[PDB]
Amino acid sequence: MMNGRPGHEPLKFLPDEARSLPPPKLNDPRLVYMGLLGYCTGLMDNMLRMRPVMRAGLHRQLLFVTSFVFAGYFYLKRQNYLYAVKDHDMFGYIKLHPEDFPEKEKKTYAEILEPFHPVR
Amino acid sequence: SWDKDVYPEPPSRTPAPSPQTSLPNPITYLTKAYDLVVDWPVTLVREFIERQHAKNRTYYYHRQYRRVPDITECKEGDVLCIYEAEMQWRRDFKVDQEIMNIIQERLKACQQREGENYQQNCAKELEQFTKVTKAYQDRYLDLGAYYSARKCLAKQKQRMLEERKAARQE
């Protein structure tokens, strides 16, 4: 949908203008859930290999947690930018074509006659 | 205690005893012994309690709910103003359930005391019941389980129209 918009650099992960957006908080509910998905992987890895699930290979478990939070942090930053761009383009379009998105005056319920449906 | 205007109660008119037999009324004896052995000790226990409740006197209040814009003053879709109009109506609708109960307490309280003259001496309470029932039926009947202000308004508008069409002919 947004592939060919103006100024769209090719295969740019985090364009420069993304830096005007607030970063993901480090303890973001979304980043934290990545940390848990990493921890489970380390546990599943020990299970599949027949090792003590929690005691064994803590260096691996630490690096699974770090890898997923690290990647999730930068992936989250990109989705924020993509979502920011979507609104940016959506609203600037509303401005450039006002005749297509007319403001409407909605009558109050004093003036509306909603049909009544008895429940007998 | 209770407010005697919310709960009207004719004054009692007990005829003064006229004992023309030589025998002793066994009711009036166990009533004395009951007062000395049952009533008197209990009243001390209660007077003891109310002297504690006087030392720790605490207060609580009836909550005031100012009036918010009606549903009729709400633009369609504005859930911010519909929500408050809807909450108010639900409060109102609930106070009307309790008004009906009060009017029912009176009618029940009159039926008992008039006894064999209820068909005659319970007219005023039966008239308020018959009137406050017609109002209730004109506000809340047939709304359904998902009753709300907007349905209450729709029911009223459909009725104000069916009556305007009465005089539009007559």
mmCIF file of N, CA, C and O in Angstrom, chain A residues 53-105:
data_model
loop_
_atom_site.group_PDB
_atom_site.id
_atom_site.type_symbol
_atom_site.label_atom_id
_atom_site.label_comp_id
_atom_site.label_asym_id
_atom_site.label_seq_id
_atom_site.Cartn_x
_atom_site.Cartn_y
_atom_site.Cartn_z
ATOM 1 N N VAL A 53 16.363 -28.481 32.570
ATOM 2 C CA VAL A 53 15.691 -27.462 31.773
ATOM 3 C C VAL A 53 16.131 -26.066 32.192
ATOM 4 O O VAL A 53 16.412 -25.211 31.348
ATOM 5 N N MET A 54 16.202 -25.810 33.493
ATOM 6 C CA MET A 54 16.515 -24.469 33.970
ATOM 7 C C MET A 54 17.949 -24.310 34.427
ATOM 8 O O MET A 54 18.502 -23.216 34.308
ATOM 9 N N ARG A 55 18.567 -25.368 34.939
ATOM 10 C CA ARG A 55 19.923 -25.248 35.446
ATOM 11 C C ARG A 55 20.954 -25.206 34.330
ATOM 12 O O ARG A 55 21.987 -24.555 34.483
ATOM 13 N N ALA A 56 20.684 -25.845 33.198
ATOM 14 C CA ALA A 56 21.720 -26.129 32.216
ATOM 15 C C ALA A 56 21.891 -24.997 31.219
ATOM 16 O O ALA A 56 20.914 -24.463 30.690
ATOM 17 N N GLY A 57 23.146 -24.647 30.956
ATOM 18 C CA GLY A 57 23.484 -23.733 29.887
ATOM 19 C C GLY A 57 22.954 -22.328 30.049
ATOM 20 O O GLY A 57 22.316 -21.800 29.141
ATOM 21 N N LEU A 58 23.214 -21.708 31.197
ATOM 22 C CA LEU A 58 22.694 -20.370 31.448
ATOM 23 C C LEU A 58 23.289 -19.337 30.504
ATOM 24 O O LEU A 58 22.670 -18.300 30.257
ATOM 25 N N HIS A 59 24.489 -19.579 29.983
ATOM 26 C CA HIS A 59 25.033 -18.667 28.990
ATOM 27 C C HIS A 59 24.148 -18.638 27.754
ATOM 28 O O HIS A 59 23.879 -17.571 27.197
ATOM 29 N N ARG A 60 23.672 -19.803 27.321
ATOM 30 C CA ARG A 60 22.724 -19.856 26.219
ATOM 31 C C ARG A 60 21.432 -19.133 26.572
ATOM 32 O O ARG A 60 20.924 -18.326 25.791
ATOM 33 N N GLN A 61 20.884 -19.410 27.751
ATOM 34 C CA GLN A 61 19.620 -18.801 28.132
ATOM 35 C C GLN A 61 19.733 -17.289 28.205
ATOM 36 O O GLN A 61 18.816 -16.571 27.797
ATOM 37 N N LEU A 62 20.842 -16.782 28.733
ATOM 38 C CA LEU A 62 21.042 -15.340 28.768
ATOM 39 C C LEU A 62 21.091 -14.764 27.361
ATOM 40 O O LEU A 62 20.542 -13.692 27.100
ATOM 41 N N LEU A 63 21.745 -15.463 26.440
ATOM 42 C CA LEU A 63 21.890 -14.948 25.088
ATOM 43 C C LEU A 63 20.611 -15.095 24.276
ATOM 44 O O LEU A 63 20.429 -14.376 23.294
ATOM 45 N N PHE A 64 19.738 -16.034 24.633
ATOM 46 C CA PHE A 64 18.426 -16.090 23.997
ATOM 47 C C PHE A 64 17.562 -14.918 24.433
ATOM 48 O O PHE A 64 16.841 -14.334 23.622
ATOM 49 N N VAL A 65 17.599 -14.583 25.721
ATOM 50 C CA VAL A 65 16.839 -13.446 26.215
ATOM 51 C C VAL A 65 17.373 -12.151 25.627
ATOM 52 O O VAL A 65 16.603 -11.282 25.211
ATOM 53 N N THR A 66 18.694 -11.992 25.594
ATOM 54 C CA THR A 66 19.271 -10.765 25.062
ATOM 55 C C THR A 66 18.988 -10.622 23.575
ATOM 56 O O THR A 66 18.680 -9.525 23.101
ATOM 57 N N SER A 67 19.092 -11.714 22.823
ATOM 58 C CA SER A 67 18.908 -11.633 21.380
ATOM 59 C C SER A 67 17.504 -11.173 21.021
ATOM 60 O O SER A 67 17.322 -10.388 20.086
ATOM 61 N N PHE A 68 16.497 -11.672 21.730
ATOM 62 C CA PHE A 68 15.122 -11.379 21.352
ATOM 63 C C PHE A 68 14.718 -9.973 21.765
ATOM 64 O O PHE A 68 13.961 -9.311 21.051
ATOM 65 N N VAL A 69 15.203 -9.506 22.912
ATOM 66 C CA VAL A 69 14.936 -8.135 23.331
ATOM 67 C C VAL A 69 15.677 -7.148 22.439
ATOM 68 O O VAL A 69 15.129 -6.118 22.042
ATOM 69 N N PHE A 70 16.931 -7.442 22.114
ATOM 70 C CA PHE A 70 17.682 -6.576 21.216
ATOM 71 C C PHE A 70 16.988 -6.451 19.868
ATOM 72 O O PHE A 70 16.745 -5.345 19.381
ATOM 73 N N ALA A 71 16.664 -7.580 19.242
ATOM 74 C CA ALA A 71 16.001 -7.531 17.947
ATOM 75 C C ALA A 71 14.615 -6.918 18.064
ATOM 76 O O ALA A 71 14.197 -6.136 17.206
ATOM 77 N N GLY A 72 13.877 -7.274 19.111
ATOM 78 C CA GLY A 72 12.550 -6.723 19.285
ATOM 79 C C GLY A 72 12.557 -5.225 19.485
ATOM 80 O O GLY A 72 11.610 -4.540 19.101
ATOM 81 N N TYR A 73 13.609 -4.696 20.105
ATOM 82 C CA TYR A 73 13.682 -3.259 20.309
ATOM 83 C C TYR A 73 13.746 -2.525 18.982
ATOM 84 O O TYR A 73 13.037 -1.541 18.767
ATOM 85 N N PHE A 74 14.604 -2.988 18.080
ATOM 86 C CA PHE A 74 14.769 -2.319 16.803
ATOM 87 C C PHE A 74 13.604 -2.608 15.872
ATOM 88 O O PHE A 74 13.209 -1.742 15.090
ATOM 89 N N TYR A 75 13.037 -3.807 15.939
ATOM 90 C CA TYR A 75 11.850 -4.098 15.147
ATOM 91 C C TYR A 75 10.667 -3.273 15.620
ATOM 92 O O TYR A 75 9.855 -2.814 14.812
ATOM 93 N N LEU A 76 10.541 -3.087 16.929
ATOM 94 C CA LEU A 76 9.481 -2.236 17.444
ATOM 95 C C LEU A 76 9.657 -0.804 16.958
ATOM 96 O O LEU A 76 8.691 -0.159 16.544
ATOM 97 N N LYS A 77 10.888 -0.304 16.965
ATOM 98 C CA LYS A 77 11.127 1.058 16.513
ATOM 99 C C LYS A 77 10.708 1.243 15.063
ATOM 100 O O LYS A 77 10.267 2.328 14.673
ATOM 101 N N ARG A 78 10.855 0.207 14.244
ATOM 102 C CA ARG A 78 10.471 0.325 12.846
ATOM 103 C C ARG A 78 8.958 0.331 12.682
ATOM 104 O O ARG A 78 8.424 1.102 11.883
ATOM 105 N N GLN A 79 8.249 -0.517 13.425
ATOM 106 C CA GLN A 79 6.795 -0.549 13.328
ATOM 107 C C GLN A 79 6.169 0.732 13.847
ATOM 108 O O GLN A 79 5.122 1.148 13.349
ATOM 109 N N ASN A 80 6.773 1.361 14.850
ATOM 110 C CA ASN A 80 6.291 2.666 15.267
ATOM 111 C C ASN A 80 6.394 3.659 14.128
ATOM 112 O O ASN A 80 5.479 4.453 13.900
ATOM 113 N N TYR A 81 7.512 3.639 13.405
ATOM 114 C CA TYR A 81 7.681 4.570 12.301
ATOM 115 C C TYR A 81 6.692 4.273 11.185
ATOM 116 O O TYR A 81 6.115 5.194 10.606
ATOM 117 N N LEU A 82 6.488 2.999 10.866
ATOM 118 C CA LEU A 82 5.531 2.649 9.826
ATOM 119 C C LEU A 82 4.125 3.059 10.227
ATOM 120 O O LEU A 82 3.340 3.514 9.390
ATOM 121 N N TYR A 83 3.784 2.894 11.499
ATOM 122 C CA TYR A 83 2.471 3.318 11.961
ATOM 123 C C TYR A 83 2.364 4.829 12.012
ATOM 124 O O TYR A 83 1.314 5.391 11.691
ATOM 125 N N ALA A 84 3.441 5.506 12.394
ATOM 126 C CA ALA A 84 3.431 6.960 12.354
ATOM 127 C C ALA A 84 3.248 7.469 10.933
ATOM 128 O O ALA A 84 2.536 8.449 10.707
ATOM 129 N N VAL A 85 3.899 6.835 9.965
ATOM 130 C CA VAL A 85 3.772 7.279 8.583
ATOM 131 C C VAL A 85 2.347 7.078 8.094
ATOM 132 O O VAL A 85 1.791 7.927 7.391
ATOM 133 N N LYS A 86 1.725 5.966 8.475
ATOM 134 C CA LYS A 86 0.369 5.698 8.016
ATOM 135 C C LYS A 86 -0.573 6.824 8.411
ATOM 136 O O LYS A 86 -1.311 7.341 7.572
ATOM 137 N N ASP A 87 -0.552 7.233 9.679
ATOM 138 C CA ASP A 87 -1.388 8.354 10.099
ATOM 139 C C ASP A 87 -0.988 9.633 9.389
ATOM 140 O O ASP A 87 -1.842 10.405 8.941
ATOM 141 N N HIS A 88 0.310 9.885 9.294
ATOM 142 C CA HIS A 88 0.782 11.089 8.634
ATOM 143 C C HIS A 88 0.190 11.208 7.239
ATOM 144 O O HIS A 88 -0.373 12.244 6.874
ATOM 145 N N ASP A 89 0.291 10.143 6.448
ATOM 146 C CA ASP A 89 -0.266 10.166 5.102
ATOM 147 C C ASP A 89 -1.781 10.194 5.117
ATOM 148 O O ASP A 89 -2.394 10.788 4.231
ATOM 149 N N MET A 90 -2.403 9.536 6.091
ATOM 150 C CA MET A 90 -3.857 9.504 6.159
ATOM 151 C C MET A 90 -4.430 10.887 6.436
ATOM 152 O O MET A 90 -5.400 11.300 5.801
ATOM 153 N N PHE A 91 -3.844 11.617 7.384
ATOM 154 C CA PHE A 91 -4.391 12.916 7.768
ATOM 155 C C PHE A 91 -4.090 14.000 6.749
ATOM 156 O O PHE A 91 -4.952 14.835 6.469
ATOM 157 N N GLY A 92 -2.874 14.030 6.213
ATOM 158 C CA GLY A 92 -2.567 14.990 5.173
ATOM 159 C C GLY A 92 -3.433 14.804 3.950
ATOM 160 O O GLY A 92 -3.688 15.751 3.210
ATOM 161 N N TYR A 93 -3.901 13.585 3.720
ATOM 162 C CA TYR A 93 -4.852 13.370 2.643
ATOM 163 C C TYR A 93 -6.192 14.000 2.971
ATOM 164 O O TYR A 93 -6.811 14.625 2.108
ATOM 165 N N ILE A 94 -6.653 13.864 4.216
ATOM 166 C CA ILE A 94 -7.915 14.485 4.599
ATOM 167 C C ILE A 94 -7.852 15.983 4.345
ATOM 168 O O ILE A 94 -8.829 16.594 3.905
ATOM 169 N N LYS A 95 -6.707 16.600 4.637
ATOM 170 C CA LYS A 95 -6.563 18.039 4.464
ATOM 171 C C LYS A 95 -6.603 18.439 2.997
ATOM 172 O O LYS A 95 -7.203 19.459 2.645
ATOM 173 N N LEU A 96 -5.957 17.667 2.127
ATOM 174 C CA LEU A 96 -5.847 18.052 0.729
ATOM 175 C C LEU A 96 -7.125 17.821 -0.057
ATOM 176 O O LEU A 96 -7.248 18.342 -1.168
ATOM 177 N N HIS A 97 -8.067 17.051 0.473
ATOM 178 C CA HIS A 97 -9.338 16.776 -0.192
ATOM 179 C C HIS A 97 -10.460 16.950 0.815
ATOM 180 O O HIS A 97 -11.151 15.989 1.164
ATOM 181 N N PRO A 98 -10.670 18.168 1.309
ATOM 182 C CA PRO A 98 -11.732 18.375 2.303
ATOM 183 C C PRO A 98 -13.116 18.084 1.773
ATOM 184 O O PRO A 98 -13.974 17.606 2.525
ATOM 185 N N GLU A 99 -13.364 18.355 0.492
ATOM 186 C CA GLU A 99 -14.686 18.123 -0.073
ATOM 187 C C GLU A 99 -15.074 16.652 -0.041
ATOM 188 O O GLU A 99 -16.257 16.336 -0.191
ATOM 189 N N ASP A 100 -14.114 15.748 0.163
ATOM 190 C CA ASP A 100 -14.395 14.318 0.202
ATOM 191 C C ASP A 100 -14.648 13.781 1.606
ATOM 192 O O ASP A 100 -15.189 12.682 1.736
ATOM 193 N N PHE A 101 -14.296 14.526 2.647
ATOM 194 C CA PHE A 101 -14.510 14.118 4.035
ATOM 195 C C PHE A 101 -15.256 15.229 4.751
ATOM 196 O O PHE A 101 -14.714 15.888 5.645
ATOM 197 N N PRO A 102 -16.513 15.458 4.387
ATOM 198 C CA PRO A 102 -17.225 16.617 4.919
ATOM 199 C C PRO A 102 -17.556 16.443 6.389
ATOM 200 O O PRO A 102 -17.971 15.368 6.829
ATOM 201 N N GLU A 103 -17.364 17.511 7.153
ATOM 202 C CA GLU A 103 -17.876 17.538 8.515
ATOM 203 C C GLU A 103 -19.396 17.504 8.485
ATOM 204 O O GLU A 103 -20.034 18.203 7.694
ATOM 205 N N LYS A 104 -19.981 16.682 9.347
ATOM 206 C CA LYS A 104 -21.420 16.480 9.381
ATOM 207 C C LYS A 104 -21.973 16.936 10.721
ATOM 208 O O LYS A 104 -21.360 16.705 11.767
ATOM 209 N N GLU A 105 -23.125 17.595 10.685
ATOM 210 C CA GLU A 105 -23.838 17.982 11.895
ATOM 211 C C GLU A 105 -24.832 16.880 12.239
ATOM 212 O O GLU A 105 -25.731 16.580 11.449
#
